[PDB]
């Protein structure tokens, strides 16, 4: 079972990557903490210092991985205007069919989100972690976007962030 993300334009099959991390924004303002994919600009993404040569949004593609467990970093955990950089210990493949979709193992992604929620729980001391879609922004930032071979591709990521974790 795979999460089939719609993408435009259709990414060639050789543009498949390994998701090595992502960047989150905590919801501002019920004992729950809500996170969404970061809508921050390129400079904000670069500050995580876990990317590789591939430029992408909401998800680091072909970047660096942590050693043993997921590592979450933030300049200020209590500042919702500061991004949360998440570095995965094990990457998550996103295989693009070339027919307008890129697929991700749903069980792998759920296990990844569960680990991220565990690290967020020990950081915010909470009991419920919720992932929700992007609040909005320009097309490159509201969608999971990336540069492959000099061409920009846009994949809707709403399926990747809509879930609850206790």
């Amino acid at each position, epitope marked *: 079972d795979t999460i089939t993300l719609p993408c435009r334009p259709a990414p060639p099959p050789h543009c498949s990557s390994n998701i090595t991390g992502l960047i989150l924004t905590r919801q501002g303002g019920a004992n729950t903490v809500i996170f969404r994919p970061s809508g921050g600009d390129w400079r904000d993404i670069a500050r995580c210092q876990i990317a590789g040569t591939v430029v992408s949004t909401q998800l680091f593609l072909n970047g660096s991985l942590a050693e043993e467990e997921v590592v979450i970093r933030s*300049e200020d955990w209590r500042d919702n205007a500061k991004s949360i950089c998440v570095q995965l210990a094990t990457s998550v493949e996103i295989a693009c069919t070339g027919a307008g979709h890129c697929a991700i193992s749903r069980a792998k992604w759920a296990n990844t989100l569960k680990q991220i929620a565990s690290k967020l729980r020990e950081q915010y001391g909470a009991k419920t972690i919720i992932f929700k879609p992007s609040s909005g922004g320009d097309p490159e930032f509201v969608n999971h976007s990336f540069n492959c071979g000099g061409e920009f591709f846009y994949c809707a990521s709403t399926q990747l962030f809509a879930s609850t974790w206790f």
Partner: antibody
Amino acid sequence: VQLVQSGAEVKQPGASVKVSCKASGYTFSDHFMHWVRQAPGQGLEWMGWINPKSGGPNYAQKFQGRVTMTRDRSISTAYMELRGLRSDDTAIYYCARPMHDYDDHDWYFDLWGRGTLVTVSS
Amino acid sequence: VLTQSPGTLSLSPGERATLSCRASQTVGSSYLAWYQQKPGQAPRLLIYGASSRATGIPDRFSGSGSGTDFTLTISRLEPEDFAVYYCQQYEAFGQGTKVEIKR
């Protein structure tokens, strides 16, 4: 260095309102734009911010789903739209710009607009 | 959560005003701000950080406090200081303290 807001608005319940905020005298893209409202005789209530480079906002949980913040860098103007208006949405709506900070704590609002009155009533 | 005290303060010009702001569910950071607001006007930044005056703020305004307790002091009240004051930490605002002229 100022923030110039659009004129006062009158709306029926259930309608929507869009308020503009034009910045001048500083680099609009180098600061987040926040929105703070104040009901008559009440305190200040933060509504959200928007990143002017990317357009990516972050709303307060209270207004999530009803508020949409956009911007237009060509005219250095930020917009706030509130839908599903209720009578208790009657307030003065301010745009506020945090100052550059040594600790990079971008919540010190040294620059405010004059506010836009929105009256929601039948 | 920011709660201020007292809700109302009645003092004559020339004497000292002490305003309090307590953060409840915080670990304790100096990221606090004090604002002054007069009727019909937007808030004016007075203190940023625990104790740093904003540009041009007169000497009689000072801030202090560590951890969860914070204080704004007006050493000698001028007639234009009688207004409403708010504290702020991230997106949270206190409910405000109104300072009025005792006569």
